[PDB]
Amino acid sequence: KIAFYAGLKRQHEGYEVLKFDDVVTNLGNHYDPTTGKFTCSIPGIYFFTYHVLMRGGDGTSMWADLCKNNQVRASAIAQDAAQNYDYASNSVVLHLEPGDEVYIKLDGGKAHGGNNNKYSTFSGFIIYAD
Amino acid sequence: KIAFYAGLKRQHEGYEVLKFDDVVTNLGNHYDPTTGKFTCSIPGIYFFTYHVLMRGGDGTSMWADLCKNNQVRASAIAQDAAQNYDYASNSVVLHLEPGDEVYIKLDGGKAHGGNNNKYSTFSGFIIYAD
Amino acid sequence: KIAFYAGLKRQHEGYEVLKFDDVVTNLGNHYDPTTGKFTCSIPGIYFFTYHVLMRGGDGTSMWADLCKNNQVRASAIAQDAAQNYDYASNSVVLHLEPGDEVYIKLDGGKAHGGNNNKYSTFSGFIIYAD
């Protein structure tokens, strides 16, 4: 059984892997909140989704991408000229091999820190094992 | 088999549980459109997602949260200074016990009523049974 | 095994079926990038999700709907008065019969063409077979 769901506790900005450290579900423990990465243990087909809230009142654009190892597999942008809150979100279905790492990377801009409120999230589960 | 998908027929505002009463799928009947709550029957791991459209042309901010019993498990905001349409959306993976209730709550602001168009939605399914 | 995930390579506008032609996953091959349609082969319960990015700097509103055959099953809008990027996204759980087609239709406005960046996406998988 492999499934996880975590939220973002602190605010972040720039270009870095987002560490979702407010962990709600983590079956099998293959999501690591100290690195922000999900690591595949079983070859198969996996679903992931993310929702990253842009910081309000400071900046107009924010990008957040889902990566597999060193390769972008989904991109998203949040943008508002009045510096309002908005989301960068996307969802994927991916085949993974053991050792593959999946994570969300900020690609510019400012993300909201939601302490325990879980405004910004990352989740996933296996659909099929090879 | 446990899965459901429902849309919002009428407009709502303030602080209340959203009743998605345009029911498309409801296997096992454990989503109740008269209360807006999904009730767990089987201990296990469940996926949920929601997409709530803010009312356009009247107001600038709207909050919508997913709750488990009396506890928020995901939060979302829609915000636009020009009072444009925008979404409060999020997704979760949760462990539930029999009797647990999962639902979407408005936490301020105005939600769009989509009659039969299904602009605003709530869905879920079991991933694992304990 | 039935699952797929594809992104939008080119920009599109108006009223047309969106052809997600940047195919990442397509188990069983029942998603067709030349038509943009997923075709059911097995009666059962299916999950779908989509995220369509509105074109920035040209236009204020865009609509994107998920359809089953000739019937809308989910709707979404992106709107920004300053012509900023924003998303039309939704998710569904549907019962399908063999031959049923599921696809995303633009219902007005301009969608972003993300070449290989996968800003705009469509994915799905079977949850239950009848």
UniProtKB/Swiss-Prot annotation, chains A, B, C:
Keyword Ribosomal protein on this protein? no
Q: Where in the cell is it found?
A: Secreted
- Tell me a GO biological process for this protein: postsynaptic density assembly
Highest taxon of the source? Eukaryota
Q: Does the keyword NADP apply?
A: no
Q: What does this protein do?
A: May regulate the number of excitatory synapses that are formed on hippocampus neurons. Has no effect on inhibitory synapses. Plays a role in glucose homeostasis. Via AMPK signaling pathway, stimulates glucose uptake in adipocytes, myotubes and hepatocytes and enhances insulin-stimulated glucose uptake. In a hepatoma cell line, reduces the expression of gluconeogenic enzymes G6PC1 and PCK1 and hence decreases de novo glucose production.
Induction field? In adipocytes, up-regulated by rosiglitazone, an insulin-sensitizing drug.
Name the tissues where it is expressed: Highly expressed in brain and white adipose tissue. In gonadal fat pad, expressed at lower levels in adipocytes than in the stromal vascular fraction (VSP), which contains preadipocytes, fibroblasts, endothelial cells and occasional immune cells. Expression exhibits sexually dimorphism, with higher levels in females than in males (at protein level). Tends to be up-regulated in adipose tissue from obese males, but not females. Expressed in glial cells.
In the complete protein, the residues contained here run 126 to 255 of 255
User: Per its record, how is this protein called by name?
Assistant: Complement C1q-like protein 3
Q: Which organism is it from?
A: Mus musculus (Mouse)
